[PDB]
Amino acid sequence: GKPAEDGLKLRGVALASSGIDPARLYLGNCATCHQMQGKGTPDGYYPSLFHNSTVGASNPSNLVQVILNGVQRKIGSEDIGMPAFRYDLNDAQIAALTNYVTAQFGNPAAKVTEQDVAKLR
Amino acid sequence: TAPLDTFMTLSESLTGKKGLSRVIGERLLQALQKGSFKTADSLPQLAGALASGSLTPEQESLALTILEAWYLGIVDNVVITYEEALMFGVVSDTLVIRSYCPNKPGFWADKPIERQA
Amino acid sequence: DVVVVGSGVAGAIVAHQLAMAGKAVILLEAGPRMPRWEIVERFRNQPDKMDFMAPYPSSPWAPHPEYGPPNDYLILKGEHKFNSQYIRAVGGTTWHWAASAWRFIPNDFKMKSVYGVGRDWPIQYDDLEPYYQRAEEELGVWGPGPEEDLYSPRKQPYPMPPLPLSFNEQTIKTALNNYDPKFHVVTEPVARNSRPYDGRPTCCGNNNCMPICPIGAMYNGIVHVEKAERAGAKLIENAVVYKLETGPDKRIVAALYKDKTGAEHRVEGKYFVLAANGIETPKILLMSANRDFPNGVANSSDMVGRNLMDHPGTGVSFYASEKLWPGRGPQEMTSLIGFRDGPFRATEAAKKIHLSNLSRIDQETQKIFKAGKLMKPDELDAQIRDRSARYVQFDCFHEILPQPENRIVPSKTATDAIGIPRPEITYAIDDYVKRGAAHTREVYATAAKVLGGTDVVFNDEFAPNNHITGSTIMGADARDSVVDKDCRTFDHPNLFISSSATMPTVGTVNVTLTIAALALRMSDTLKKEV
Ligand SMILES: *Cc1cc2c(cc1C)nc1c(=O)[nH]c(=O)nc-1n2C[C@H](O)[C@H](O)[C@H](O)COP(=O)(O)OP(=O)(O)OC[C@H]1O[C@@H](n2cnc3c(N)ncnc32)[C@H](O)[C@@H]1O
Ligand code: HEM
Ligand code: F3S
């Protein structure tokens, strides 16, 4: 992958009225965790998703899989967890976000997820 | 030599920072000026006065604006930049910025690592 | 079966409970449903990030207070303007709250029967203790262990432990504690996740509590509105209720609302739950008036809208002798619960003082630039870290007595877009609070001298803390009240009020937890009848 800058020019610009704007989907739904540029915080914790496995695989079923539910790593009597997006995102909203993610982070070639979202629910 | 290279290298002179994103620098540029060049010029003329002797009063007012534009990230009461806003990355070591999580939970337990000291 | 008006924490819970009981429910929501992601970006885009209502647009049909700039949606008159704020949108005002989950101390539930001022509750603390915990279990609240005495007897410990305190809050905690133990500075009980809880995440020092958490780490009314819909509850967004209709059995049979267009609709149910906010609940009541109840439904007492209360706040800002770096962690984790109680409380009011853990590099940077004097980037940065690190601010809650002269009535002139009369609030601050603030200022001056303060600034303007209470007072008899101890209205059997309006005393803390408990109270009550 590589640092985004996608939002670098998206700050101060009023929010769109209707239609999936994948760029802003990451900004509002994510960034606050993986950070605007997708670099992830210093002390690892929430990782940078521009040099991740799941983010850039080939068949991103395991990718969206996370966006839907989240993660539950309970090991080390100090457990983690990326929250849920099953009730706060639509199959179209998710699929359009996935395509943005992969394309601008992972190897976009196999980055499909064309309403495979619903089937994953 | 576009009215943008002049600004960038005029900004690094005032901000004292290196690696400023020209993407932001242009937005700041657009907002600092109107649809005009009257602002796009006089930059070179300024860089000379600054990186030399005394500065003419109203030549200072121009600089002061370029500073605020970069640090605060708002010009004419409009947010052009918030994350890259230069005031947030002068004590960093790990950037804070309100609305974004630095490191992880317990991060705020121990004493912050003051920078340039 | 049950028709709940307002999808705020209060109503949200009620809907969920009976929704679980297998009862058919209807949740009526005045404003529209704004999703998490959208709100954050609005904020990130706003030039003033100290205006906590800004990122919540006041939809013409369901307007609410906005002071950036003033949308003058509230008609204020009297001695002091009641410039409080709420959020009309699917999720309630808990979208922009600080998540400070405080319990009312026993003595709060018997003020006149102890200090001989204000009014007593028809219930005592030990009556709400079991519900208080259930409220801490539903919201997901972290709070200190026995070691820290919150003076509210616990039958069971908090469901979550508190994460480490901010270097700023831990420093000033110890500094003052070791000076005078009477200040009794303790870890604040709050609805913030100290660990992945309720399927949600854990705090990552977003320091954005107000105006919003972009994770769900802390509790937001929306959590139960969700759980509510998943239970079977039918939620109707953009259904601004304006009138309630009665049947010969002085019972409420239907409520009418206007959609975005202003087109009046009618909703029939068996039981009714008035889960609007402190100003909106009394407005609907003082609006449904008919020949059966000329003074407005459940207002035979003429107490509806009256006895309005909200902590008249008072703060202090100075530059400490030592670096503290406020912004590393939640906006508030410390609370000086020293003067929450005591005999004097029969003269001046008791206050809870809270240390500010908000980022000030935003404000402090601006303060330097406002100087309008050019300086090299070495001297600039030097002042930025020097100012933003050493900045400390103390805000506090004062208690004002429930007074009938303080009231909320629908203006008989002014009206909103869809043509509903807009809230006209007449508020004034008695000397009972003035004397309390006076001694509260002596504590501020001392807190300064201890933390080696410089440029000490005193905020002597009573600030709104946005805790609307006493609109639909609770009492024993119906000649000086509106609802009984069951949160039921004397006038209408099947009408229930789930809001801070039902709270007789405002106390010394944030009321939301008290509200969530009372909500769960009714839940079990309504759950047996229907
Ligand atoms: C503004 C604020 C409030 C606040 C706070 C910080 C700020 C900036 N910090 C708090 C804190 O630290 N601790 C605490 O305990 N409270 C704090 N607050 C106050 C808190 O947000 C509120 O007291 C509480 O959320 C009230 O909840 P309740 O369920 O009683 O009501 P609501 O949240 O205001 O939601 C009202 C709902 O009703 C709907 N509504 C209103 N009028 C109508 C009509 N006419 N018809 C239909 N629906 C209506 C609203 O749309 C909303 O959904
Ligand atoms: C929002 C749209 C969002 C996306 C998308 C997203 C993606 C994502 C991926 C692909 C991973 C990799 C995990 C895997 O193997 O599949 C991942 C991991 C973590 N995330 Fe995330 N994430 C989104 C949002 C958020 C938010 C809002 C948070 C926290 C507030 C968060 C956190 C995490 C964490 C933690 C992990 C890994 C845990 C760890 O490394 O310790 N994500 N995310
Ligand atoms: S917004 Fe978020 S994680 Fe912590 S301090 Fe405030 S809660």
Numbering used by the authors:
A (entry chain B): 305 to 425
B (entry chain C): 52 to 168
C (entry chain A): 10 to 539
Paper text:
One of the most prominent GDHs capable of DET is the bacteria-derived FADGDH complex, with the first reported example derived from Burkholderia cepacia (BcGDH). Bacteria-derived FADGDH complexes are composed of three distinct subunits: a catalytic subunit harboring an FAD cofactor in its catalytic center with an iron sulfur cluster (Fe-S; 3Fe-4S) as the primary electron acceptor of FAD, a small subunit which is a hitch-hiker protein necessary for the bacterial TAT secretion system, and an electron transfer subunit harboring three heme c units. This enzyme can transfer electrons liberated from glucose oxidation directly to the electrode without any redox mediator as a consequence of the architecture of the electron transfer subunit. The electron transfer subunit is required for DET, and followingly, the dissociation of the electron transfer subunit eliminates BcGDH’s DET ability.
